Symmetry: C4
Subunit: 384 residues, 4 copies
Amino acid sequence: QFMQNTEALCDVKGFAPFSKDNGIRIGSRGHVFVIREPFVSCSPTECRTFFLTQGSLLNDKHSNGRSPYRTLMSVEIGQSPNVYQARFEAVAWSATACHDGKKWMTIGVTGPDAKAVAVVHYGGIPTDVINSWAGDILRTQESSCTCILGECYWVMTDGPANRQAQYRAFKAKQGKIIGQVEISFNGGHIEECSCYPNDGKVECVCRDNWTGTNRPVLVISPDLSYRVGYLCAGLSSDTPRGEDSQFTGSCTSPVGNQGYGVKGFGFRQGNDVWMGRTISRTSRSGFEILKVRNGWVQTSKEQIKRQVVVDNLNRSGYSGSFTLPVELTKRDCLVPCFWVEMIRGKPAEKTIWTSSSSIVMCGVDHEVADWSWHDGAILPFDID
Amino acid sequence: QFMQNTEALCDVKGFAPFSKDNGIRIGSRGHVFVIREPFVSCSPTECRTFFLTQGSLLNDKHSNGRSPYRTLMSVEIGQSPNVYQARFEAVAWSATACHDGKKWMTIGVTGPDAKAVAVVHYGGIPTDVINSWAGDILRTQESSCTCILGECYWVMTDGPANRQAQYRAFKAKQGKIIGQVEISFNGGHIEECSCYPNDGKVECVCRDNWTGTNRPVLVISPDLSYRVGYLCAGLSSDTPRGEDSQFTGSCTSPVGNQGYGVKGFGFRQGNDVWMGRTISRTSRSGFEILKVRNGWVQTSKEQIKRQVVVDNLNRSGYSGSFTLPVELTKRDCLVPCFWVEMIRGKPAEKTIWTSSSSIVMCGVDHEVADWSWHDGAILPFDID
Amino acid sequence: QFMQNTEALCDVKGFAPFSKDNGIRIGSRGHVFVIREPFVSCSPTECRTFFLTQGSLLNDKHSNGRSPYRTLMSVEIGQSPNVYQARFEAVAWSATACHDGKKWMTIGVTGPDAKAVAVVHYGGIPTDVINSWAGDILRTQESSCTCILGECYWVMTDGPANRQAQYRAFKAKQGKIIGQVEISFNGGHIEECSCYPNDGKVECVCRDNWTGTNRPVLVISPDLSYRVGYLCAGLSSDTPRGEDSQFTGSCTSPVGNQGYGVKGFGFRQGNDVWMGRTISRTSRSGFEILKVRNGWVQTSKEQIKRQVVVDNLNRSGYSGSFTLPVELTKRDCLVPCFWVEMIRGKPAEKTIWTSSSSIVMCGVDHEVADWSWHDGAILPFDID
Amino acid sequence: QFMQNTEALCDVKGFAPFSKDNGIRIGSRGHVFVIREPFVSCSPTECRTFFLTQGSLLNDKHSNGRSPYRTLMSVEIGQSPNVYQARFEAVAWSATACHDGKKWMTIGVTGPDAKAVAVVHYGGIPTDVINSWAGDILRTQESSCTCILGECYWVMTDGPANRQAQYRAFKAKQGKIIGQVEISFNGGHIEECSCYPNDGKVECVCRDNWTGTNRPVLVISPDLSYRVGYLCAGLSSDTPRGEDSQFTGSCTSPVGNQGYGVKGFGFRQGNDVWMGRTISRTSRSGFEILKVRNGWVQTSKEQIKRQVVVDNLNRSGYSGSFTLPVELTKRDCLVPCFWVEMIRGKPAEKTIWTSSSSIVMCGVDHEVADWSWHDGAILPFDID
Ligand SMILES: *[C@@H]1O[C@H](CO[C@@H]2O[C@@H](C)[C@@H](O)[C@@H](O)[C@@H]2O)[C@@H](O)[C@H](O)[C@H]1NC(C)=O
Ligand SMILES: *[C@@H]1O[C@H](CO[C@@H]2O[C@@H](C)[C@@H](O)[C@@H](O)[C@@H]2O)[C@@H](O)[C@H](O)[C@H]1NC(C)=O
Ligand SMILES: *[C@@H]1O[C@H](CO[C@@H]2O[C@@H](C)[C@@H](O)[C@@H](O)[C@@H]2O)[C@@H](O)[C@H](O)[C@H]1NC(C)=O
Ligand SMILES: *[C@@H]1O[C@H](CO[C@@H]2O[C@@H](C)[C@@H](O)[C@@H](O)[C@@H]2O)[C@@H](O)[C@H](O)[C@H]1NC(C)=O
Ligand SMILES: CCC(CC)O[C@@H]1C=C(C(=O)O)C[C@H](N)[C@H]1NC(C)=O
Ligand SMILES: CCC(CC)O[C@@H]1C=C(C(=O)O)C[C@H](N)[C@H]1NC(C)=O
Ligand SMILES: CCC(CC)O[C@@H]1C=C(C(=O)O)C[C@H](N)[C@H]1NC(C)=O
Ligand SMILES: CCC(CC)O[C@@H]1C=C(C(=O)O)C[C@H](N)[C@H]1NC(C)=O
Ligand SMILES: [Ca+2]
Ligand SMILES: [Ca+2]
Ligand SMILES: [Ca+2]
Ligand SMILES: [Ca+2]
């Protein structure tokens, strides 16, 4: 049976802690991959954490830091990314994964920068390929893809990381690419889309790495018509970004004139929006989630909820979205969840290596207090 | 199929050894979580050990000792709480878990002391939340919850650990809270209830951490009517406690005028009772189980059985109750079992860390000899 | 479905290598239990290796050598007895296990020498108990028990290890003891029986630790009538033993006037017999298997086959029997298999610890060449 | 259900990366077997990596280098050959394995050089044996065997490694040998065949270790009629070999007059051929795959595709073939895949040990760019 995933996303008032893997703490002694770019995706029976290894273990000389050793692997949600619980998925230095109700689809991108290859896998074997079409680091979401009615959808970019690039959406059935579309977005920039199903469409909130401090939004229909623009809200959710009091929103255009960025996410809540962001404006530190009234449709600054998940003295990193399927929840709507990556090590910290751990939160019908579920590893390590 | 668990508890004459995990011994070299608060709960197909990790491994610098790293995880009964066999359950510094016949329900409490959040999980995803209602360390059983006819029941406390607090019982179906009751117990104190099903009711034997050296008893009906009082028996089963020869029982009121306490358990046996206690009156050392004639209904001192499980030269700790379901036993009654936690390390011992291991015993129809299945680890460890 | 196991044992011409776990070699670096007394038993879907741990790991200070830490655990056949693949079965310093077609039955004996308790487990929970009836180390086979038509059978001893003791056979269904018999064997001694099904009976070949250099044989019928005596063959198969040229067989009585012994096995082959023995007469070194014409029924010295499995420069240890069920083989007969335990460490070798590894061989229809699949570990280890 | 595997092999234009296990990198710290001779084979539900351990772990003193410790084990494709994920298959210093749709068949050869024994296992138990028929290292493919319509086929050699030997093909059903044929190949030499199903036949491409720099080809029909010769193509694919510009092909006879060799593979593509080879002509370094027009039927030098997988500065080793079954792909043809073994350590490198890791590629309908997915371990290791 294919998962329909045609339901509305649930409207939620707060987010509760789902899991914490403690991967780095455990890796001081246990056998745990150096990783980065973790993400969560669910099947009808379980949620799993996916991650890009460096082909090396914490506290080993090989952790010394797009290589040909990076692989996509997965564990059950809340397990550390440890060697002896890991399932191999793909050769990959960029990836996305999702389940259609019947099997896991994973996409791993590997190969040379000038001519990369994305291998689509379905049920644990390779089934199709997409080669780079613009010759400049073909790359993808680093979070869950989205499956509706047995067809799965994802976004890729090829081109410069800091100026205009090219963006395509793809649709597959049972691991075969059956459609694609080029997304026209002159002046805009899309990287590392965080996508989820809502009302029979794929809604993605992405990263502008060129000039925008606000985030791109892309809404794809099953026939690959789409709409694209920027998240309307009058609060900026990229990093780096400027102060909220100097920010004016835009539904159409990049605002803030700053480079760089970080993968993040948001969720539509009718006309409102939940948006995540690092607490710091200049560095990947802290993590808060804000609900903004009419923030999906207008340049609103009307904050109605805020929750802190990692405090501002502690490192954060990427964040991303996924949903709980109704075959697990028995709800009439899709429950929205997110993860946060907490990066440790170089160059900010004096270590030879870099890795991350994660925390996962899911939408519930009550507000939840602020706290900090930070990484908690004690650096440097023995190897340093 | 839901488990009925409407049967009488079996009347048993002695307890036989079920498992011993040797977690600390194995942790001198293997990759094993620092834990405390282990417990056992069964499904129709297996028994599992649940435990609260410290987000760190034995013999690692992170084991140096309510943190945001503590997690609830589980293994099959008698496996050490090791990294590579562990199943992740919840973010938690207090917990309870049980199976309804179809899936595992777990509850993990995390967050700040002033405003904690308990996340209910069902079949490995979050499904409901209970926030602190009194603002002072919302907390729960640290042992098995109890499911009857597809509805599961547990006890929580919010308030002071050493004076009057507030106590509630909750009922859920498929991970959704469908009822709750405040337990009126003015002058009494309830913590860390050890509960089991008997004759279509939930019977719990708890810890009074305020003034009582005797244990509270709470009997909850499926409609959330209840009765509450103290275990009648004229022998005290908390620690610390006074000498038995200075003790007089009470069915209604705390006796002994001493603070502090330890999680323990008892089982009704018609009108008699099996009660566990540490052998020492002043410290968590040794473990014995006593059967007292009419001890459930009267202030009896008539001991009819005694069995030692850990001798008085060796550390003990918490203990708790669970039952074997009839779909495993094919009996006409629910078999009563208990576990004992054996704590090692600081402050009693000169180590930087604290953890525990466990032994599990089940009720049988013959008396079993005394012995000592103690922890057996050799301290200090390399890290110390 | 219960396994019938009513078929004749296959008549076999040689034995082929099934598995080798390399447990000690791997334990120089990996996380592997110190063990002894390994054995193999099969279900309709797989063969497993069972073993008695010391509650400690190789190369750790706890391996420094009937304790309360010993446990029965199991892995798939040919896996090292490593922590992260092990299934917990029982608290045990002596054990037996077997499958009835539906579930695993295990028996673990633990407790004090004067008053030990054997806990019967069935499908991973305790289900019955046998307490010591003579007050002197209740003990059992250390190899597979035998199930026929859904009823399982095993042998136990209680009493002195070096003079007359007492011996009982037990029958269980679904983990409940439904029958027992005392085996009258005045002047004889039975320990550590190696049993298998043949033609709807249980045939066991045991160890005489009192005066015999020949092995006891016990044949039990489903109704617990039995016959008992000694393996007829005019070659001695215990260790220690005398030279074959000074040996005369007996069907009825212990021969050779020597103490001590080692667990071993034999298989009836119509009127012939396969018998295992250490190659050395004085120490547990080497391992050979001999087929003797009419050796089951007469004091024959007519050797018709010989195969070496461990050469005489290498350590051996216990050996034992099990059979392959027809639901795995699709044969019309039960295939006979054996294992050999290869003990390493103290007192023979200069180490602080003692453990073993294993090799498993199964009966085939062709002769197989001699070789040596010895342990191969390099002692002492780092810990020594 | 038996797998038919009667379909044509798919005609493919390039090969995409399936997996990379990073076994040596991970083994610098993790618990990973010293191996060599890895290979991949698939069932209807998954692909697995098989490998011959040395009965020892990387970075341990036992890794110090046909022993009686070598075993055949397997993991899921892309897992390192680590202790705690490994499934035991056979005692083996040479091996082959394949699935018939219902169960795994494995063959492990062990024993003395003069009189080796090959044990056939089926569904995880031994089921038949083949003893050496020529008394000189009985040996087999070190890659996948081939199953068609429920019958499985493989090739073995017995005799000298460097002059004329003897070669047989065998057929089994459910682990029982039901047929065999001696392959007449006077003047030729066959070792380490790489076989796959194509159009209801078994096509194998092998290693000539006597005089040929070209590879033998053997095509076996289900009734054990066969044809044998050499791969026609006018490019040599063994190592060592001469320059392509001095090479003329032959369909019938060994060409190049050089000894030694390396296990490799090729795939028929109608009348064309994909052939793998090391990039170096003198050493096992680099790996490229070439498609040659009419290379199956004529001495063609017409190269139409080339892809590099390991560059020529990096070590390679053995390579081999397998196919994806239609029950995984839902295609109308069998997808061709190969693996490459990347050997590290002595004598080329200054270490006490030798092991390998692997990369796996599968046939797709687009060309894929050149890259290098080399081993990447940093030698020497701590133990050296
Ligand atoms: C980590 O690596 C440092 C840099 O080494 C150099 O750069 C790398 C990329 C390689 O090409 C290597 O060959 C070069 O030597 C070292 O200088 C340093 O020793 C390393 N540190 C530790 C603790 O292993
Ligand atoms: C264990 O920790 C001891 C105390 O350290 C101090 O307190 C903790 C809570 C942290 O805030 C830390 O920053 C402080 O330094 C140490 O003094 C001691 O080194 C540690 N021992 C070992 C063996 O790791
Ligand atoms: C192994 O143990 C040796 C003997 O120790 C003594 O006997 C044991 C049974 C215990 O009671 C212990 O308390 C006694 O100290 C030691 O002398 C020796 O250090 C140990 N060796 C190693 C390498 O750990
Ligand atoms: C590795 O082994 C070297 C050679 O040792 C000798 O040869 C082997 C086959 C055995 O017979 C052994 O008994 C002999 O001693 C050693 O000389 C060397 O120490 C070893 N190296 C390390 C680092 O373990
Ligand atoms: C190459 C552009 C890309 C998106 C901005 O840079 C990413 C940014 C990163 C970052 O900002 O942390 C690390 C990513 N692993 C990297 N992606 C790849 C494929 O290299
Ligand atoms: C906070 C009061 C509570 C019950 C008395 O104290 C417990 C006692 C403990 C103890 O007495 O050993 C340790 C428990 N982990 C702690 N519980 C929590 C949630 O912190
Ligand atoms: C206690 C008598 C018994 C049988 C002879 O001794 C056995 C001999 C042993 C041996 O000879 O190797 C080791 C066994 N683990 C031991 N059994 C127990 C339960 O201790
Ligand atoms: C014995 C001849 C054989 C085929 C040429 O040599 C092989 C070559 C090898 C090699 O060339 O790398 C290593 C193999 N493990 C070895 N096979 C066996 C069974 O020893
Ligand atoms: Ca930006
Ligand atoms: Ca108290
Ligand atoms: Ca004897
Ligand atoms: Ca050659």
